């Protein structure tokens, strides 16, 4: 719905150069931590990480121009396809970003009966991730156990 004038948003593109600092067109935890270190001196290592997770609304793990506008405009997320798995997902997601990072299972698996070690948390998702992108999406989640 609607559109955005790329010509007018060109002023915001300056954040993909000056804000970026390195000039690669992608805001990552490194450059962000650099800017926040000189013009901030408050956000910790874990802070800038969570902060970036507060920007990435698509879950691609990379700050892109399209989501830049979304972050600075409408912070709302829908949900209505994961019904049953949602009951499980809300507990499996923990942080609330859809994809499984690692820390989430470190809670549900440790509360599963045994204790989940951080060394096995990588091996487990590497078995879970059928695509091999490094993340656990709802797609592969249902297309693994429920889908025979």
């Amino acid at each position: 719905a609607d559109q955005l004038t790329e010509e007018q948003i060109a002023e915001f593109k300056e954040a993909f150069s000056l804000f970026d600092k390195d000039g690669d067109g992608t805001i990552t935890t490194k450059e962000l931590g650099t800017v926040m270190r000189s013009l901030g001196q408050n956000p910790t290592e874990a802070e800038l990480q969570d902060m970036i997770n507060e920007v990435d609304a698509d879950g691609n793990g990379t700050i892109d121009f399209p989501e830049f506008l979304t972050m600075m405009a409408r912070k709302m997320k829908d949900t209505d396809s994961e019904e049953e798995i949602r009951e499980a997902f809300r507990v499996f997601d923990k942080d609330g970003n859809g994809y499984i990072s690692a820390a989430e299972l470190r809670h549900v698996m440790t509360n599963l009966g045994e204790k989940l070690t951080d060394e096995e948390v990588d091996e487990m998702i590497r078995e879970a991730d059928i695509d091999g992108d490094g993340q656990v999406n709802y797609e592969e989640f249902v297309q693994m156990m429920t889908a025979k």
Partner: peptide, 19 residues
């Protein structure tokens, strides 16, 4: 491998939701 643990919570959820 905790992989088998992946289906456990999900299976338990399915069972609980089916119950």
């Amino acid at each position: 491998r905790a992989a088998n643990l992946w289906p456990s919570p999900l299976m338990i959820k399915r069972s609980k939701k089916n119950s």
